Structure 1
Amino acid sequence: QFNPYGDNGGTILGIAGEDFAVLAGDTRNITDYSINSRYEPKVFDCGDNIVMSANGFAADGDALVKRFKNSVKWYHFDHNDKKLSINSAARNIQHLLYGKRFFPYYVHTII
């Protein structure tokens, strides 16, 4: 039987300061006991001073980030170049994820 999911490993970490925030991730990408890459970027600048990472199954992670980046682009077009606030970005991501409730994106996301 075909299994549509996989595990690319990796680990990510977000910490919020007083007037700053960090999002950190390791650059290793794996399947089973093989190393696929020693440097495969996992944390992405998405515009509007928002950083994102969707760790887990890398194909679903890339797909989600790609869709959110696009969501930011279309938010600018549809609302007069207004800055997407972090709270608004978060609610948008909930709808992106819950849209595939019965065939999920296999990731843990931090912004």
Structure 2
Amino acid sequence: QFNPYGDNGGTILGIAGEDFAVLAGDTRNITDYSINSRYEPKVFDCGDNIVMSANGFAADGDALVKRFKNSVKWYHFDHNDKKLSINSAARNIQHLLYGKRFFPYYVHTII
């Protein structure tokens, strides 16, 4: 039977200071016991001072990140170049993920 998911490995890490935040992730991408790439970044600048990583199944992670980047683009178009606050970004991403509640994005997401 066809299995629509995979596991691309890696791990990510976010910490918040008083006037800064960091989002770190390794650049290794794997399937099973093989390395696909030693440098494939999965932590992205999404505009509006939001960084995002969606770790797990890379195809799903890239799709989500791609969609969120797009969400920011349209948020500017539809709301007079307003800055997307991190709290509003968080809520927007909940709806992106939950919209696929019955066929999920297999990713742990941090922004």
SS of the counterpart of 1:87?
A: helix
**1:45: how far off?**
0.1
Measured on the aligned residues, the alpha-carbon RMSD in Å equals: 0.2
Deviations along 1:47-91, whole A, 9 cap, x unmatched?
A: 000000000000000000000000000000000000000000000
Aligned pairs, number: 111
Offset of residue 6 of structure 1:
0.2
Inter-partner Cα distance in structure 1 for 2:26 and 2:32: 17
Secondary structure of the equivalent of 2:47? Answer: coil
Which residue does 2:54 correspond to in 1? 54
Alpha-carbon displacement from aligned partner over 1:84-109 (angstroms, at most 9, x marks no partner): 00000000000000000000000000
5+ unaligned residues in a row in structure 2: which ranges?
Answer: none
Give me the whole-angstrom Cα distance separating, in 2, the residues matched to 1:9 and 1:41.
12
TM-score scaled to structure 2, two decimals? 1.00
Structure 1 residue 8: Cα displacement: 0.1
Q: Distance in 1 between matches of 2:3 and 2:39?
A: 26
| Superposed displacement of residue 17, structure 1 | 0.1
Residue 6 of structure 1 corresponds to 6
SS of the aligned residue for 1:24 comes to: strand
Structure 1 residues not aligned, in runs of 5+: none
Aligned partners of 2:99 and 2:74: how far apart in 1? 18
The runs of 4+ residues in structure 1 deviating greater than 3 Å are none
Distance in 1, matches of 2:101 and 2:18, equals 35
Residue aligned with 2:75, SS: helix
Identity %, equivalent residues: 100
